[PDB]
Design a protein around this ligand. Structure first.
Ligand SMILES: CC/C=C/c1ccc[n+](CC(P(=O)(O)O)P(=O)(O)O)c1
Ligand SMILES: CC/C=C/c1ccc[n+](CC(P(=O)(O)O)P(=O)(O)O)c1
Ligand SMILES: C=C(C)CCOP(=O)(O)OP(=O)(O)O
Ligand SMILES: C=C(C)CCOP(=O)(O)OP(=O)(O)O
Ligand SMILES: [Mg+2]
Ligand SMILES: [Mg+2]
Ligand SMILES: [Mg+2]
Ligand SMILES: [Mg+2]
Ligand SMILES: [Mg+2]
Ligand SMILES: [Mg+2]
Lengths: 362, 362
């Protein structure tokens, strides 16, 4: 796709800027420049670019309807690409650190970054820090003189914090809340009392929705100077709804989509995660199913994991998923109808966003 | 000390703000609030508060000589405390992640954060991310309306990036540059060709000087609206000089100061670090000393580490350290004399900063 290739051409610019600046201001040597170029490529490319391409689509929408000089159109488009890369680099940071946290093996069809033989956990941790740092370098360099600079930095910062809090909800979702204690080694829950749709919703709201949907949508609005032309409460409702759905699919694919197709190897069962599948299963199983789940969940043993997967297949969670999906379509369409009132162009971008999400197979 | 106790009283405010906001906007539950309060306390308290108390001292200096209403004096002092905590939280972030990277056992006289039984590497990584996030929450909340806000955020961001780059220089200092390669597992250097004072200086300049000295000094200037009243080139020279000296002491103590006194257990020998001791040693040893160093450095075996420590004692590095110290005193005094030209009060703060650094035994 041509537009994708163009968003990609701005990656090339941003990379050249970052690496040149390392040479000229940070005393980097050539082989460390090469290392960081490879690290940027592996952690920032290969994904679907949904978050990045959402910023661009939001801005393209407003450009079709807004009068500007050509030079202004070019500036806005370039701004939207740079903001999109800020979010892809933030994603790259999150993915580096999450793969370590989750004990993951594959990412975008390659070894996780920390599994590269020449990298290891020790360096990946810091490479993840550098990725985040680059988002700010990029923002201050490109947007220094833009009116939306303070708004963008302030939003970016809140969104990052929400995600970090969400990650803490996730990484501790298999422990009992009353037992959390830095001094005491953490046993896994035996009762699964906290595997509920409300608790699940809390995980997912913070860890994914803000950075995957709120952030790109609003950044599209910032670089378009169009924020005031939308109902923000609606922007937040729609971001959190499509965001949750997006995470539910991720959870389902972790279990049932082949690594060949997904580009990653699942760990949610093994990691004892509060996934949608585990929650929806406890939502419907009988006493004996519950017990066999309890004896097998959250263990790396392939035979225990297979037992969990059979239980999932037997419980017909495909039926629950259809019904959940049908409900989201209802609410997202409602939200999109409500957005046209003030912002038809934005509502349309949100439609496109939803369509792309709804259809994804990875 | 009373002033310390007062800087400390602003920690209490900042903590209450952060935890209340987690409850009211982030849907946190009480036991996770407790966990993060304990995490903030363990990772942010117990240090010497040098960086934090430098912001306060810089501002107190300008207040003694500048006319203000009392209300303004109180605002400036409070601003200096908050900026100081932003840097202590940044330090706490760096320390959490560094202890993981370095395989360290003790920090401020307690187990490293990731060694707490109830924490582990998996959670500490994210706790370190939250610490950094909190610096921005704190900045945007407290300084939203201040004229120095953009300057402070932009400086903070550049300083953080420099430190992250510096950390990459450190963590790869025991490998040959020409051999760095994400695809290939990294062998330790055999020739130690890159253990040179120039390369050492590069490590230390980036990993420590910006965040430990440039940042607090300039933040004191920002919250004092006094930046324009100094020669910034001199501020940078003095920060980088005292900063390097500060790191040299850290390196010496890692080897020779008892854990009981230091509050940490050294790993530089075991980690094959490019420390000042390793560099100054190669700076003077004879052929046979060089060989015995090479056969023992960068191995966790207590007998190999002891061999390295004997070689250090025999080479009389205490003599090199005295001579290095004497030279820094010369240059720092020169820089302080040069600061009085435009900024006597600032020169004095820098004198106090130097005196505290020069005298430290931990
Ligand atoms: C590091 C802060 C946030 C990370 C973050 C937030 C949201 C999602 N993810 C990563 C996914 P996956 O590993 O790609 O399947 P998850 O592990 O959640 O299933 C990672
Ligand atoms: C994580 C980014 C920077 C970390 C950073 C920078 C500078 C210094 N440190 C930490 C010290 P130590 O572990 O306290 O002795 P080092 O390990 O360098 O001897 C840590
Ligand atoms: C589920 C989440 C939030 C992490 C993976 O996100 P994506 O599936 O969008 O990953 P890439 O396209 O960037 O690979
Ligand atoms: C050497 C460096 C830069 C890390 C430790 O810094 P400090 O020795 O200042 O640690 P605390 O006082 O914060 O414990
Ligand atoms: Mg994961
Ligand atoms: Mg995860
Ligand atoms: Mg997943
Ligand atoms: Mg260390
Ligand atoms: Mg270190
Ligand atoms: Mg040290």
């Amino acid at each position: 796709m041509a537009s994708m290739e163009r968003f990609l051409s701005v990656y090339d610019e941003v990379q050249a800027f970052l690496l040149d600046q390392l040479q000229s201001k940070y005393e980097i040597d050539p082989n460390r420049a090469r290392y960081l170029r490879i690290m940027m490529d592996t952690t920032c490319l290969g994904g679907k670019y949904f978050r990045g391409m959402t910023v661009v689509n939001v801005a393209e929408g407003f450009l079709a309807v807004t009068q500007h000089d050509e030079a202004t159109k070019e500036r806005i488009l370039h701004d939207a690409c740079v903001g999109g890369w800020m979010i892809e680099f933030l994603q790259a940071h999150y993915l580096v650190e999450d793969d370590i946290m989750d004990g993951s093996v594959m990412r975008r069809g390659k070894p996780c970054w920390y599994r590269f033989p020449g990298v290891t956990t020790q360096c990946a941790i810091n490479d993840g820090i550098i990725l985040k740092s680059w988002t700010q370098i990029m923002a201050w360099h490109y947007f220094a003189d833009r009116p939306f600079l303070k708004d963008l930095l302030c939003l970016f910062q809140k969104v990052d914090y929400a995600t970090a809090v969400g990650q803490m909800y996730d990484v501790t979702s298999m422990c009992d809340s009353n037992k959390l204690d830095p001094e005491v080694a953490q046993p896994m829950t035996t009762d699964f009392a906290e595997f509920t749709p409300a608790i699940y919703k809390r995980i997912v709201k913070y860890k994914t929705t803000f950075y995957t949907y709120l952030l790109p949508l609003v950044m599209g609005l910032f670089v378009s100077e169009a924020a005031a032309s939308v109902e923000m409460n609606l922007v937040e409702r729609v971001a959190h709804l499509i965001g949750e759905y997006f995470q539910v699919q991720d959870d389902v694919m972790d279990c049932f989509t082949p690594p060949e197709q997904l580009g990653k190897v699942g760990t949610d069962i093994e990691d004892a995660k509060c996934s949608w599948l585990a929650v929806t299963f406890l939502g419907k199983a009988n006493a004996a199913q519950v017990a066999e789940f309890k004896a097998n969940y959250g263990d790396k043993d392939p035979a225990k994991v297979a037992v969990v997967k059979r239980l999932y297949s037997e419980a017909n969670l495909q039926a629950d998923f259809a019904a959940y999906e049908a409900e989201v379509v209802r609410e997202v369409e409602s939200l999109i109808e409500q957005l046209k009132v003030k912002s038809p162009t934005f509502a349309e971008s949100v439609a496109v966003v939803w369509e792309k999400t709804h259809k994804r197979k990875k």
